[PDB]
Each structure stands twice: as C-alpha cells, then as structure tokens.
C-alpha cells in the first residue's frame, strides 16, 4: 500500500513482554500461528486457539463495558452513560476497576471494553450511544484513559472499542451467512466519509488517550470508512493507529467486521473473532485459510508472526502465565449454538454493591425544580410507571444480551441497555422498594400503579382515584434501546406518554425520573407546572432505588450534568444522523465536520432544552477569580505508552501531552445547603471555521458547605490547545487570541479570560 | 480593504515631524497641491515652492552614481562595481562622497540608491548594473549603507524601485505625447508576486533602506497583481506604511502615476514629474488635486499626510537652517527646457582617490593559468575600442549616456546608460595605464582600437601585431541601458571577432570584460590561449589606474561575482523577461524565492563562475568554525525601526536582534600577499526552501604569506527566519540549520550545525 504495516516493538511500558512474546512467536510453526490469530468454540464471547506445544492456553475474550456479560455471581455495574454523568474522575476510575476486579475472578484474559469514541455521538438516537460516555472528544478521552486503566490495574486486558468513525447502528450490516442468506448480498456496510481534520481532532482523540492508558487491544468497526472496511482499512489501521497514534497492541476485529482474508491480513488486522463460534455464521476467513495463503506465498508470515507478537505481549505484560485468571465457568453463547453446562462462582465483593450506589447518587440529574425537591416528609405518595419495580419476568428474563423479551413485556427499571454491553443482574433495588422504606420511617403510606396504562383493565381509573389526594406522585418513565437498531425517535417507550398525560390531569406535585438510554421528547409536559421536578438517572445498574431516593430526600444533593445536549427537537441535531437506504453501498457523508453534539448547536445558535454539562444542585455556586498561571508547567512522565504523533513544536524531550499552562478559578456555595459542583473550562480556539468552544477541562468539588469556597484547578496540555494541519501532517499551536471561559455549563460560563502564544 | 496609516516621524525624525505637521496645518489647499506635485526646473524632477511659508522648491536629481547631467563632478562606479568588492567600508564612502556631490551640486532628494528593484530575476536586466548584488541579504548590507552615505552628507534619499520591478521590456511607463498614448497600447508588465516570495526575497533589501533611514521611496512602473505599484493600496499602505512602518514619502516614477484618485487613495505622496517634460508623463494632481479636495472626492486629511511626509526629510536634514546652494545646470535639456547652465566644480580631494580603490578592490579573476601577475613584458600588444576613448569624447551619448549611433566606438564602458549614468571630467583609459607602465620597463606597447571587422585593414594589423607581443590584451565591452532588456548574452560591438582574432595570432591573451552584467564568452573560456580573464564592471572614471596596479601584482584582485555566471542564458529562471504585445501582459513569478544561485543551486545547474566567485594571486584556508552562542546583542543603532510581526516579539525586542555570532579563520597558504572575502551561507530548514542563503561575508585586508585572521558574522534574528503565510509573522522555524563559511558559495570548506 501507500501505508506498511510497522512491527510492534512493544513501545514504553510493555518492553519486556514484547521480548518475551517474540522469543515464543519465533518458536511457532505456520499452524500454530494462525491457531492463536483466529477464534476458537468455547465458552466465552470468543477464545483464541491454543498453542498447546509451547504451553499457552486459549484466552478467553469476554463482553462488556459495563463488566462481564452473561455470567451469574457478578454485579450490574452503571453504563459508562451514567458513569460520565458524574463528571468524578475518581469514580469512573473505581468502575473500572471493580469490573476489572470480576472479569479477572470469572477468568477472562481480555475485556471487550471500554467504549472509547466509536460510537463516540453524532447522532443522539444512536441505540448504543448508552455504552460510551460523553458526546465530548476531551471529556470521552479522559473517562477512556480512566476506564482503560482501572481495567488493566486488575488482571485484564482491554480490547478498546470501536475503532473507528462507528456513528449509527442502522446498515452497519456485519458480515453473516446463515440459512443460505449472506449480507454481502443485500447491503454492504454504512460508510462513514470522513475528512483528515475530523479524524484527528474528533474521533480519533478518545483513541490516542486509550493508547497512552494502554489499552492491550484494540476492536475495529463494523463501518467502512470512505468505502472500506474498517478492519481491513490500511490508512486507518496501519497509519493512523500503527504509526500514527504509535499502537503497539492488536487489532481485534468486530464479530463479523471481517469480511476477506488477504485485505485484512496486510491492512492491520491481528485477530479474527469469532472464527469457529457461533457456527462460522460470522465469517470465518482465516485459520485453515490463513496456513494455506501463508504456504501457497499469498501472504508473508513475517506479517503474521507480528500479528502473533501483539497478541501474546498482553498475555505477558498482564502476567497470565505465572498468574493464569482462573477457569471460566458458564456458557454465554447460550444452547443450541453452544451445547454446554455452566459451573458457577460468585465474585461480587464486599464494597462493589456500595460503589454501584455511589455511582448512581453522584450520576442522577437534576433539570427542572419548581421547589418540590429535596422532599420534606410527605405523608401521601404516589408512584407510576412499570419502570417503578421488576420486570415481570425476572430482572434476567431478557436473557443473555437484555434483548429477548417481547415487544410490549413490563421490563421493570431500565438499569442497563440491549446488547453485548449489558450484564446480569443478581437482584434490582427497584425505586418503588425504596421509596416505600423511606415512606415507612415516616408513618406514610405509598401506593403504586405499576400496570400498562393504556392495556390494563381498571388502570386509568386506579390512576384517576389515586393521585388527587397524593402529597406527591413520582412518575417513572424510559426509554430502551439496544444494539442492531437506531431509536426511529425520541419517544419515550411504553405508554410513559399516556402516563404523563394521566398524570398531570390529577396531580400538581408530579416529580418525573427518567432511567434511559439517551434523550427523550419530554416537550408536552415539561413547562407544564404540574411537574415540579424533572431527574434524569440513566442506567444505574442493580442499585437503581437505593441511589436515587436519598437524593430526591435530601441526604444528598444532586451533582449530576448531562453529558450531551438535550435539543427540543430530533431537527435541530446534525442533519443526516442516521442514513436509511436500501442502496448497496450506503453512505454517510460527515460534512458537518467536527460540529456534533454541543458544538453543532452552538455554531447554529440553536438553543437546547439542557445543555451539554448542565445539571441543578440544591443550592447555587458563584465562580470568581480567574488564573492563568503561565508558570504552571510540567513534563508528561506519566502515561503508559507514547503516541508518535507530529507536532510542530517538536524537539527531542518533548510532548504533545506536557501541561503548558494551568488555569484556576474560585467557586463558592452561594445558597443554603451543602452541595457538591461540576466545574467546567472551555476554550475558543482561533482559526477559520473552529467551534465557538471546545471542552477542556472538567473538576468536582465534593460536599462544598454554606458560603465556604474552593478553588478549582484546569492542567492545560499542549495538545488542548492545538489544531491539526491538514497541509502540513501534523498538530500546532495556532496563533491569535484565545477564549477561556470557566463555569457549570456549557452555557453557563461567568468566567473569561484570554490567552495567547 | 487597507487604510492610510498617519505619519509621526517614528524614531529619530520625531522632531522633525513635529516641525513638519505645524508647517502642513498652515498649508492652504492650494499650498497642499503644489507640495505635492512637480513643477518646471533645472533638475530631474521639482516639487513646488509654498511661497507664503517660505518652502522653496526642492530638487529631485538622478542618479546611483551622482548627479546626472552635471559638469563638475566626478563620475562615480556603478552600483554592481562596488558590490564585487564585497567590502563595505567602500560601499560607504563611495555613498558618502556622491552624497558630498550631490549635496554641493544643489540637491535636495537624490534619486537614489537603487535597493532591490530590480533585484536580479532576469542576468538579461538592462539596468540591473545601477544595484548591487543578486541576492536580498547583501543587497539588503550594500542598500542600508548607501542610504547612510547619502544622508549622511546632507541629501535626502529617494530609495527605488518598490517593487518586484525585474525587466525593462514592457515597462510601459504611462505617457501622452503627439497623441499617441501609452494607455491605448499596453499596460505595464503585471509582475504577480506570492505573499512569501515578497517578504523572503522582495521586501528584504527594502526593509534594511527604511532601518537606514531613507526619506523617501520610489514606487515602480510595472504592476504588481494587475494594479499599478504607484496605486496599489496592498504593496504602499499595508506592506510598506504598515509592515514597514514608513514614515517618509512616496513619490511615482517618471509616468508611474496612471490616475489621479486611486494614487491619492493608496499611498502615493508625489506626483512626479507633474509639468516638468511637457506633462507628457501624464499630471495627474496638480490642479485636478486642488479640485478634488474641493469637491470632496480625496479627503484633505489624507493629502496633509502627504504633505507632512515630504516636509519630514527637509527638517530632518536641516535644509531650512543650512539650504542647499541653487542648483545651476540644466539637466533636461534643450528643445525641452531652454534655460541656460552656469558652472560649479563640486569635485574634492580624494575622491578619484577613492573611485580608484574601489574599481581595484572590484576587478575580479576569473581565470588565470599563470600569466597574471605581468612581471616587466617587453612587447605588450592591446586590443579593442574598450582600451580607449569615445571617438566622440566621453560625453558624447549626452545627459543620459544613450544617445550615441549603435555603432559607435563608445569607448571603455565607464558607466551604462540611462537616468543611472553621470557625466566624466575624463577617462583614464586602460591603453593610457599600460602605456605608463610599458614606459617605465622601458617597453613597447601598440593597440588596435578600431573596429576589426568595418575599418579597412584592421585584420591585418591585428595579424602582424599580436605574433611577437609577449602578452596581448583584449578589451571588451557590453553596454545596456534602461528601457531594454539584453536580447542575450552577446559581447558588445566587434568583441567576439576581436576574441577569434586573438586566440589565432597569441598564446598569452588576457581578456579585461567592462559590463552591465553577465556575457557570454563560452566560445573562448576554455582556450588555453585564453591565459588570463577579469571582469572590471563599470569603473567610473578611474578605469585604466584601477586595473594596471592589479595586472602587474601591485595588489592582488580581491573583487567576487556579485552574481553567477550560467554558460547559458537557458540555465537561469524561466521566462526571466517575457515578450507580448498582449494588452495586459503578465509575469507569474513562480519561481519564487529561487533567483540567480538558489535557482541553480536547486536544480542542480553548474554555473561555470558561481555566485561569489573570484580568484587571487594566492589562497586562502578555511579553519576552526566557532558557533557562539553567548554572543547576542539587542538592536540599538537602527535610524528607524520597521513593524515587521515576528513569533517572539515580546515588549523590548527586535527582529534586528544579534542572537549569535559566528567566527571562522583564515590563513594565507600561497606565496603572496592577498585580500580573502568569506562568506556564510545557512540553510533554513523547511518546505521548499533555498539549499543556502548568503547571511554574512567579511573581507580581510592584505593578509601576509602565512598569517592567520579571525573572520567575524554576527547572526540576527530575521537572518535564520521564515515568513509564515498562515501567520502572517516572520519566526524561526525548528529543525537543524546548516551553516557554512567559505570563500564562494560553491567552496564552503567549513560547516556545522545549529538547532535552536
Ligand atoms: C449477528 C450477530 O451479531 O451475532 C452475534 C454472535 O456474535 C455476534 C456479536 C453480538 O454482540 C452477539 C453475541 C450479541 O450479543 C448481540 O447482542 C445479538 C444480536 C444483535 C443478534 O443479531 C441479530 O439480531 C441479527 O441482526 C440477525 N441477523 C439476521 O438474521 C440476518 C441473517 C442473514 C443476513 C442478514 C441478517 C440474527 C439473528 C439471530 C442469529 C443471527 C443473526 C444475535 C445475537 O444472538 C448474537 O448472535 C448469536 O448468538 C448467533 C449468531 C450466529 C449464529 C448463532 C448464534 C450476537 C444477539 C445476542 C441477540
Ligand atoms: C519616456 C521617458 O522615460 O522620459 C523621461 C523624462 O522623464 C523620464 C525619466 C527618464 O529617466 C528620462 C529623464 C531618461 O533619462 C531616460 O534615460 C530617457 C529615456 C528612457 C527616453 O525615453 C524613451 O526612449 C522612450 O521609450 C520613448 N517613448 C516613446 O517614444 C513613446 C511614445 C508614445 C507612446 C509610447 C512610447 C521616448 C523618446 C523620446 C521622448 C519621450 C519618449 C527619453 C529621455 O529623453 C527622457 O525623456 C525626456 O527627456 C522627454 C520626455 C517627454 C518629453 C520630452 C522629453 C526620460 C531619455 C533621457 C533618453
Ligand atoms: C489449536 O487450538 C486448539 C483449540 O484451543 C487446540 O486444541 C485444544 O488443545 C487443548 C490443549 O491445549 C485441549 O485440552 C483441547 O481438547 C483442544 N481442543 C480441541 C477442540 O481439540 C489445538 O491443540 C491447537 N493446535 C495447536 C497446533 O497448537
Ligand atoms: C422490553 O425489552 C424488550 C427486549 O428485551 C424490548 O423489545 C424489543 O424492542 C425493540 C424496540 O427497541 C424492538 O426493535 C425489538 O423487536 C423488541 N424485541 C423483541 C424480541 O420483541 C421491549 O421493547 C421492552 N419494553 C418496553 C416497554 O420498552
Ligand atoms: C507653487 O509653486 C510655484 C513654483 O515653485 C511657485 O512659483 C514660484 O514662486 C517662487 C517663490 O517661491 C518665485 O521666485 C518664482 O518666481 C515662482 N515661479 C513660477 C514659475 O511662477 C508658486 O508661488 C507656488 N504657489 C503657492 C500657492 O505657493
Ligand atoms: C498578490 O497576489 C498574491 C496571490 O493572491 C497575494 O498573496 C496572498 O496574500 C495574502 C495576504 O495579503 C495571504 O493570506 C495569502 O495566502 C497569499 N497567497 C499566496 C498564494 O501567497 C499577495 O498578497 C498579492 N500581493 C499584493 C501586493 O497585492
Ligand atoms: C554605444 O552607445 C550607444 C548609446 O549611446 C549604443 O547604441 C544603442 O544600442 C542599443 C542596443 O544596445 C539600441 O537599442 C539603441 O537604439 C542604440 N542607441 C542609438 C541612439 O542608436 C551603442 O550600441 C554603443 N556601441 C557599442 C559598440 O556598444
Ligand atoms: C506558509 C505557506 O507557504 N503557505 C502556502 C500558501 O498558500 C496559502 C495558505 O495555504 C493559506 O493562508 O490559504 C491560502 C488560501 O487557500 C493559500 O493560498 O502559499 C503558497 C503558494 O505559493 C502555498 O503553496 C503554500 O504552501
Ligand atoms: C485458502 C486457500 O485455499 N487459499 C489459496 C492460496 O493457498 C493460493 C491461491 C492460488 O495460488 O488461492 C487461494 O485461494
Ligand atoms: C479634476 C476634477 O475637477 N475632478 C472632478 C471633481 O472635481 C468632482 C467630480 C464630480 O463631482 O468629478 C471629478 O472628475
Ligand atoms: C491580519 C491579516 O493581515 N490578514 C489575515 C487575517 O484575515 C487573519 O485574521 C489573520 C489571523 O491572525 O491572518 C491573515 O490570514
Ligand atoms: C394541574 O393539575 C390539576 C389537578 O391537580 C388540574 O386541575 C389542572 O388542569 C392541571 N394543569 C395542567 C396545566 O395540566
Ligand atoms: C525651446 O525653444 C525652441 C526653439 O528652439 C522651441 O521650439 C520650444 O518650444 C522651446 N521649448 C519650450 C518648452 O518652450
Ligand atoms: C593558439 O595560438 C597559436 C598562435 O600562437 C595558434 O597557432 C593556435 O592555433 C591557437 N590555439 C587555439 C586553441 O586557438
Ligand atoms: O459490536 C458488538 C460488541 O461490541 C462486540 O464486543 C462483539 O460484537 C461481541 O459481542
Ligand atoms: O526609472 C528611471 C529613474 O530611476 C528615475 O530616477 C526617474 O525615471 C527620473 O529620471
């Protein structure tokens, strides 16, 4: 090609399990090569083949982002949607880490997590945007470095997903041939078109953090990118990952992202998944292939032994073989794909129970308070919505993806999304049973209407002669989405319109909680001043209750922003979000350059509902005295692994990383109860078509008491205030003023200041 | 799109500006138009008196080597002559001692110096001789100096050409005249310049003229971008007033001006030369200003700024406290002015003095097979018109040295022709040098100076002569002039006869080339006949003792190759002078900065004499090449300071700044006495850039046999910097820099590294 493949040469951190995965990779014969570079039948998501003679085991490569999935004596951690929602560094680090913590117990040797940028947010109806985090370059590249982190800390190699420019679940149309129907035949995959300048500045940061963490693996796309195939793209994979972003690990494909053998094998790809799982359904281009173009001269096994060398330098950095993970016990393939028993291990820990809490208590976000909240001591409570309590199968009845049950089944709390990022729960603390523990302590009574108001005989008049003489009614709404599909719109799901439509009609203290996957269309209610209260909790995994009331009690307060912008309308997003076409070779032209989410309405002077990192607190925050400290520079030691990425300011001891400056403001609780704060720092960055501002920096102060203060601090990188040349390749510093501006939201902003080179 | 920026005298015209403001606030409007505007008069151009405030008139007086069209003064050599000495201690004097003329002659504004344009695009230039050398950076030395001379004396400078004006052909200076209009035949040549190339190669020497402080610049006659230099608002307002920070004046070329009210607009402050020949080069302002103030169409805020820029120099250079005496020639001529000359002697005490060293210092050896230097020849043979006078007497061609028949025999090329020539007192020919000397080895010498293929029996007499000479000399000449370009490289009059002539009937030939610029002698370079080559340049009158001294070893030659010297015209940049009878003829400079040695340097051209080339009676080792760093200095002796933006400006910084310095040695390894110019060249690391840029030289004196010296280049900011487009700033870019020193810019025995 244009564009070689480099050898890995096991970079900063991995230096002597590189030696080590090349002493072992010369000893291989061609078989054996191709055994560990190809997916094998077992148990877990996927498992690489053996090389039995020089004693390396099968890995077993296990889904997903929020810890591993289908395996029973786990927790339901939160999705990394609710963790962002936190905006504490601190807690999405301890995810990770406990998830790490289980996916090491249950014996995988490489978590297929985190999502880091892909799909990273250009369409808000993206039915797996819940996966990720932010809707933000700079604030996704910090949770990935946290979250590949905390991975790696325990025993676990990261397969960081999904690599790249995977926008919309609509037409990504992997590869399967199944009952004689191949989608080769129907539709070639969604296309993303991308310019050089969006790939550097938008969806490849997230990937350059993860890198620096280092991410072990990394998974590529079921999209093509300019009209080819994500896994086998050589400027993609080769350069701009290989070389480029420095990527000494491997790349995983997707399960069907494969869609040839010898494209693939030159282009980048390590590892083919799932090989011989899930029947061969998924296309199965190499193993007994491989050999066969290696000896017949089609493909170099020079290329191949590199392969090989980044698979088995996680095995070793990791340190698997003198700490092998233990055996890996249940069937997640689920019969009659795979026919085979489960054992069964418990590793949920003390303290992981009281994270997933945590979590939830510092997620949940508060957008409309009329003065109903924090509640006092009702004496008469009310409660709708199936979402209230269980799902009336069983927490797992949507079985091993949370994406089986009926299209009209009560699914109970929505704590997690559909697909191979969801887990099992062990139980749901469901809002109902703690509303009612709280209702009990305060001699109260409670009452819930849990049924399908539209379906079920006598609903609407339990709803009618219930509500009039509540104190307050809680109502609990949301919306599921899952893998495979885009939500068409943002309705809520169910009959959670009819139900705050019934609501408003016999209650004027309606306090709304919204558990969902992404955005919803609350616009017919949510000026109606019956609703005094409008939060949104996300998916708060098994805890979903028992986070969220000491919050709506006032034990708590509210600390939650959103972590992408709620528009009032699907319209005023990025036109063309999701392509729907029956064409061939479908296509998706990203001409809206880097201008998603938050910078596209704020560049079209469209204003949201809630803005991006908007959240309400119990009490108010005054922000004063700007600093741009110029002498608080500093030396990036830090990271794991170092990109290769170009900048203009090169010299020898240098780095795109180093902090240049750091800038400080002051915050002080101006109301009357203790709360904690997101801070934010934004900056405009001069050059011709830039956005208005750009994310680039976030901190939260914890527990900030009545008229005390606390100041708030912004290291700013090299990198955060540069712009990629497309004419010369490379990151610089461009000239001219620039904006900082310090505040609580994205357009919430007191503070500013200028800063020039 | 760009606005007019105020005059306030800057640096240290601060209290002349001052003076200058008060005067122009009293000015009527009519006062304002007659300031501003030519009038009729002795000198080349004449700016109106404002009677009432007792302003006199001033004269604008031609030319970059004196005054033009004088009796009494000395001619002077041409700008290309001083240039090949690399030495700028003469640079100075020679300005110095024209500013001592042109002051005592009666001037007020010497048009001159010429400092970059023309630069050298094209070696075909017919006035490329009036400047210096091809090459922005000693340009931009020899410019800054030569204003200082001038100024320094008390004379006003009028700097010139701005800019980008590379060829004569299809000037197309505006003129009306019988009713034929140079307006219905062909707008000037539209020289199409790029951002970078304007600063990087352009702008340079100009920059260094406004540090020095000239008074003035004059705008060009070919467009730049379509638009005319005398009214184009980016090159006067923006890149000059603003970038540049000029404070002095703006006065058109003669028939620069093409209309009234964008001039007014875009930068222009003089209309030149108004009444004065006619009107015949349009007049523009004048009355027509006085009516456009009138009427409100040109704001007469604007012209007072005009004015205020014109008065600046005259306080400046205390020309009210002491004036010039009247000026007394009349320098236009007859049937155009009648008027009547008077006679001043203006010539002093050493100044043939000084025109002798120069022209000594200049000569430069480009050849020599071991017949220079002459001991005491017995039988010397000469040859060529070039070895004696004009036929018609030394001025003959008349007040701009161009009048003469084509086929005259014009004698030594003295000076070239056009408004840069100056009248001579006498020539003191190379035959009258050679002979002195011949005289006192109690020798015979006999010269051929006819034209050897017109004049009967001239052949053979040449054939007769030349077999028993002990050496024989051959004199040739190529005379240009303003307003063509050379059709080639071709030797003037009979001189490529003369050159088959000589190598037929002589074994020991020296060829002596006086020259506006390069010729083409590839017929003969190679012949071992050929012993000896010199190019003299234009001497000035001193042309026969400048030479003979450096013939017969009294001093070795020291003079460099101001520019190269391609074997052919097709090895330098394309297109260098186009021809079109198109309406709106255009010249894309797509080149860029790649002129004269950064042409053939990156095509990889071998020259066959490069760009500061030039032998000596001995040679010279280059060693110890010290880079120190330590050595920096801020920028305090500049007489005015540009704007220019630069990346690491802080509060009390410049781009003039020395950040280092670098030091080189040189020792005497031959067997006599000899002077060495040195050379630094650096290359600037990035995108298509020059492989080297001259960036200093220095000239040791008369170093004995086996001495050593200590050469000595300090290194500004602005000399390892690049101008940034996107930014539109100058800055230093990273990367390694290679610096080199050595004795031509194809000998560079001593190199190192620089990152910063
Ligand atoms: C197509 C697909 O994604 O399959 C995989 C298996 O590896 C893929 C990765 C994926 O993350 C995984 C494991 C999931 O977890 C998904 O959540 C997931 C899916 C999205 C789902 O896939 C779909 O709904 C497909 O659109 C659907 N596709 C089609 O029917 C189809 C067939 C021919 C041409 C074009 C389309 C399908 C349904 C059932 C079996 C295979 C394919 C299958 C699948 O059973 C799950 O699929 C299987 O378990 C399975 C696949 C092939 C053979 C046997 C079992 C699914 C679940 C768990 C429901
Ligand atoms: C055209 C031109 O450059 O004229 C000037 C006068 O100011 C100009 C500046 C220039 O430096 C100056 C003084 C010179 O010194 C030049 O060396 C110089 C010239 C270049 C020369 O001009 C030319 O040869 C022109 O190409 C020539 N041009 C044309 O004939 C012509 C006519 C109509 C349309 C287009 C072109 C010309 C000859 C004679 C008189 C006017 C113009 C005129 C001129 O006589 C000299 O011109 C005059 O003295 C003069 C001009 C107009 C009317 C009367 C006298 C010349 C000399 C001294 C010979
Ligand atoms: C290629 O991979 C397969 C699958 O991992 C290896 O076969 C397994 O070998 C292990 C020992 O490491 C046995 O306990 C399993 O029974 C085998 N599984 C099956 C399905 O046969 C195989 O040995 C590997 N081949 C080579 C050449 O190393
Ligand atoms: C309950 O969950 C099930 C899945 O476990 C949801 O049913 C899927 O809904 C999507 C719409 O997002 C359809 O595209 C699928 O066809 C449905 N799956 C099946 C198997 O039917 C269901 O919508 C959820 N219930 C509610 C009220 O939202
Ligand atoms: C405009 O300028 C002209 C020409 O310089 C001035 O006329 C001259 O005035 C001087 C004194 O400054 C006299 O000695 C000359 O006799 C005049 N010459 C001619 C040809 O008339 C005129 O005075 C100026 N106009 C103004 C308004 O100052
Ligand atoms: C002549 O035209 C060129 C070509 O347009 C001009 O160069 C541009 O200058 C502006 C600054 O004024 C830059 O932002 C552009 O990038 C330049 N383009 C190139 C290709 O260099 C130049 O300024 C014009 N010169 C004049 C005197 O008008
Ligand atoms: C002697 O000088 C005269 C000028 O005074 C030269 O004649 C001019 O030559 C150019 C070509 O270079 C012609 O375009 C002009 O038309 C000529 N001028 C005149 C007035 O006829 C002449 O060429 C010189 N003699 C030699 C031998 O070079
Ligand atoms: C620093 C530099 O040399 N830049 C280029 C310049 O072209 C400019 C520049 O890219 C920018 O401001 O955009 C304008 C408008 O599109 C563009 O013209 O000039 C030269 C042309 O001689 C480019 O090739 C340079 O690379
Ligand atoms: C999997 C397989 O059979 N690959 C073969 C390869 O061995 C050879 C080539 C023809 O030389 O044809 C390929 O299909
Ligand atoms: C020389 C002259 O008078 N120029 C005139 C100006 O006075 C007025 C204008 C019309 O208002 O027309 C211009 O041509
Ligand atoms: C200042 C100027 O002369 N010209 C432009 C200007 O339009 C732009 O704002 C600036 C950025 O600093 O750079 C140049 O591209
Ligand atoms: C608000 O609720 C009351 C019943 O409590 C009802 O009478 C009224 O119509 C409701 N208002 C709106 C705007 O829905
Ligand atoms: C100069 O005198 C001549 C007569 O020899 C005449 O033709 C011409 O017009 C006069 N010039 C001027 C400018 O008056
Ligand atoms: C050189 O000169 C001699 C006369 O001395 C002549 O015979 C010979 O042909 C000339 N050689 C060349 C190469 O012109
Ligand atoms: O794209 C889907 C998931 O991200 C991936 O982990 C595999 O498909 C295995 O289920
Ligand atoms: O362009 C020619 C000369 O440089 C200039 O000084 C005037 O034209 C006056 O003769």
Not at 507 to 523: F, L
């Amino acid at each position: 090609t244009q564009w070689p493949a480099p050898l890995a040469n096991g970079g900063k951190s991995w230096a002597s399990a590189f030696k080590k995965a090349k002493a072992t990779v010369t000893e291989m014969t061609v078989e054996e090569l191709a055994n560990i570079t190809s997916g094998v039948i077992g148990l877990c998501s996927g498992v690489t083949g053996a090389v039995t003679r020089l004693g390396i085991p099968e890995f077993c490569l296990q889904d997903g982002p929020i810890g591993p999935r289908g395996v029973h004596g786990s927790s339901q951690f939160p999705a990394g949607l609710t963790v962002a929602a936190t905006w504490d560094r601190t807690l999405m680090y301890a995810r990770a880490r406990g998830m790490g913590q289980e996916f090491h117990d249950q014996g995988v040797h490489l978590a297929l997590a985190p999502v880091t940028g892909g799909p990273l947010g250009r369409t808000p109806l993206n039915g797996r945007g819940w996966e990720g985090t932010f809707a933000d370059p700079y604030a996704c590249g910090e949770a990935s470095y946290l979250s590949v982190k905390g991975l790696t800390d325990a025993g676990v190699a990261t397969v960081s997903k999904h690599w790249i420019a995977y926008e919309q679940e609509t037409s990504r149309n992997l590869y399967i041939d199944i009952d004689g129907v191949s989608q080769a035949d129907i539709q070639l995959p969604i296309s993303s078109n991308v310019d050089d300048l969006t790939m550097h500045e938008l969806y490849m940061w997230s990937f350059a953090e993860a890198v620096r963490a280092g991410t072990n693996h990394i998974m590529c796309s079921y999209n093509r990118i300019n009209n080819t195939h994500s896994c086998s793209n050589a400027k993609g994979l080769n350069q701009l990952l290989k070389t480029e972003l420095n990527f000494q690990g491997g790349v995983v494909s997707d399960w069907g992202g494969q869609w040839d053998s010898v494209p693939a094998a030159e282009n980048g790809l390590d590892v083919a998944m799932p090989g011989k799982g899930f029947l061969g359904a998924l296309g199965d281009f190499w193993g007994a292939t491989l050999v066969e173009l290696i000896n017949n001269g089609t493909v170099s096994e020079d290329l191949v032994r590199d392969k090989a060398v980044r698979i088995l330098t996680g095995y070793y950095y990791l340190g698997q073989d003198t700490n092998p993970p233990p055996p890996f016990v249940y069937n997640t393939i689920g019969a009659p794909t795979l026919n085979a028993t489960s054992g069964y291990r418990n590793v949920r820990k003390p303290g992981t129970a009281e994270l997933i809490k945590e979590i939830g208590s510092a997620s949940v976000t508060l957008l409309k308070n009329t003065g109903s909240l924090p509640l006092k001591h009702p004496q008469r409570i009310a409660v709708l919505g199936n979402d209230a309590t269980y799902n009336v199968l069983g927490p797992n009845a949507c079985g091993l993806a949370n994406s089986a049950c009926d299209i009209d089944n009560l699914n109970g709390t929505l704590t997690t999304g559909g697909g191979s990022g969801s887990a099992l729960s062990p139980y749901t603390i469901t809002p109902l049973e703690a509303l009612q523990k709280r209702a009990i302590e305060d001699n109260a009574e409670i009452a819930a209407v849990v049924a399908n108001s539209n379906t079920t005989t006598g609903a609407e008049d339990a709803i009618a002669a219930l509500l009039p003489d509540a104190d307050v009614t809680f109502v609990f709404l949301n919306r599921y989405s899952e893998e495979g599909a885009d939500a068409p719109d943002f309705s809520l799901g169910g009959d959670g319109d009819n139900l705050m439509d019934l609501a408003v009609t016999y209650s004027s203290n309606v306090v709304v909680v919204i558990h969902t996957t992404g955005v919803v269309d609350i616009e017919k209610w949510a000026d109606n001043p019956n609703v005094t209260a409008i939060l949104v909790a996300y998916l708060p995994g098994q805890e979903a209750g028992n986070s969220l009331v000491p919050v709506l009690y006032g034990d708590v307060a509210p600390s939650g922003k959103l972590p992408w912008t709620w528009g009032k309308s699907i319209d005023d997003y990025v036109p063309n979000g999701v392509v729907y076409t029956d064409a061939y070779s479908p296509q998706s032209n990203f001409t809206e350059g880097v201008f998603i989410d938050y910078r596209w309405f704020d560049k079209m002077g469209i204003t949201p509902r809630y803005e991006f990192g908007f959240g309400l607190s119990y009490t108010t925050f005054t922000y004063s005295n700007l600093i741009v400290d110029h002498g608080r520079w500093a030396k990036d030691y830090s990271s794991v692994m170092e990109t290769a990425e170009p900048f203009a300011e090169w010299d020898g001891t240098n780095s795109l990383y180093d902090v240049i400056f750091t800038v400080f403001a002051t915050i002080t609780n101006t109301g009357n109860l203790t709360g904690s704060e997101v801070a934010q720092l934004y900056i405009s960055i001069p050059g011709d078509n830039q956005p208005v501002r750009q994310l680039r920096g976030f901190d939260k102060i914890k527990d900030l008491p009545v008229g005390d203060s606390a100041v708030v601090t912004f290291p700013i990188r090299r990198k955060d205030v540069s712009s990629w040349s497309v004419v010369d390749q490379l990151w610089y510093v461009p000239n001219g003023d620039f904006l900082i501006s310090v505040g609580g939201s994205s357009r919430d902003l007191p503070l500013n200041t200028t800063w020039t080179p």
